[PDB]
Amino acid sequence: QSYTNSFTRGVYYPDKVFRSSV
Amino acid sequence: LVKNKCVNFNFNGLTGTGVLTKSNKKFLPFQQFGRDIVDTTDAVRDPQ
Amino acid sequence: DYYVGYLQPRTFLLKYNENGTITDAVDC
Numbered sequence A: 001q002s003y004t005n006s007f008t009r010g011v012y013y014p015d016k017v018f019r020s021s022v
Numbered sequence B: 001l002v003k004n005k006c007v008n009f010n011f012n013g014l015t016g017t018g019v020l021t022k023s024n025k026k027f028l029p030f031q032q033f034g035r036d037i038v039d040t041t042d043a044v045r046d047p048q
Numbered sequence C: 001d002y003y004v005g006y007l008q009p010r011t012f013l014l015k016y017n018e019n020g021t022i023t024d025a026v027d028c
């Protein structure tokens, strides 16, 4: 194997609350 | 369901009082409730 | 062909679109 870097991956929705432009 | 009138509502165990009107906010299919900037539940989706 | 990572507690800043879609995030 090798070692790399993750640019910005790994973001998921924390909850189920709708928000608009905040 | 009663709209444009002051009623007591119970949506999936969520209870409150207010006036239910049509909105234009677009939830995502996995979202149920909606919340304002601080704490209040501004929007809600009919389960049916 | 596959990658593995681990998670840590952290504070993040998220941006919600005028839909509900998340478009950008900023670490703290």
Ligand SMILES: *[C@@H]1O[C@H](CO)[C@@H](O)[C@H](O)[C@H]1NC(C)=O
Pocket: B026, C017, C018, C019
């Ligand atoms: C919301 O998403 C729809 C596509 O599902 C798009 O047509 C519309 O312009 C979007 N508007 C926003 C960002 O509120």
